[PDB]
């Protein structure tokens, strides 16, 4: 079995497919999801980072901007303001974004930084 993960944004969809293991961060801390659990609904943090693992393929590090995780019997949809790929993120832009004083900017930069390798 696998985990159906679909990263959708209020403006457009980013990714959609199956995974072997996925981890996300919400107001209740970080949590892991497997392809054999029960439904669930949690709200991701501002600088939340989702890690979608692929069976046989390298995981996908993406940054979510205030998104929400919704797990079902055999489906997992993630709705957020927007998403960003670790390969598209820039160590410079991430640092600056996190350096900003604004809440939105600080969130994006923090989320992108995490996907890059940063923590908290």
Q: How does strand 76-80 pair with strand 3-9?
A: parallel
The experimental technique used to determine this model is NMR
Q: Are 3 and 18 in contact (CB under 8 A)?
A: yes
String of b and e for 67-78 (b: at least 16 CB within 10 Å)? Answer: bbbebeeeebbb
What is the distance, to the nearest Å, from the Cα of residue 105 to the centroid of all Cα atoms in its chain? 17
Q: Contacts by 16-20 with C-beta closer than 8 Å and gap 24+?
A: 19/52, 19/53, 19/54, 19/55, 20/53, 20/54, 20/55
What is the rounded distance in angstroms from the CA atom of residue 92 to the CA atom of residue 69? Answer: 28
CB atoms within 10 A of CB 4: 16
Burial of 111 (0-12, 13-18, 19+ CB in 10 A): buried
Number of domains composing the chain: 1
Range of the domain at 78: 3-116
């Amino acid at each position: 079995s696998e985990i159906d993960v679909e990263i959708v944004a209020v403006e457009r969809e980013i990714w959609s497919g199956k995974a072997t293991f996925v981890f996300t961060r919400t107001t209740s801390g970080e949590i892991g999801i497997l392809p054999h659990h029960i439904p669930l609904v949690a709200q991701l943090v501002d600088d939340a980072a989702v890690k979608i693992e692929r069976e046989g393929s390298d995981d996908l590090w993406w940054a979510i901007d205030g998104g929400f995780l919704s797990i079902t019997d055999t489906k997992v949809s993630i709705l957020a303001e927007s998403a960003q790929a670790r390969a598209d993120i820039d160590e410079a832009k991430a640092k600056t974004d996190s350096g900003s004083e604004d809440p939105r900017v600080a969130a994006q930069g923090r989320a992108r930084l995490r996907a890059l390798g940063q923590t908290v």
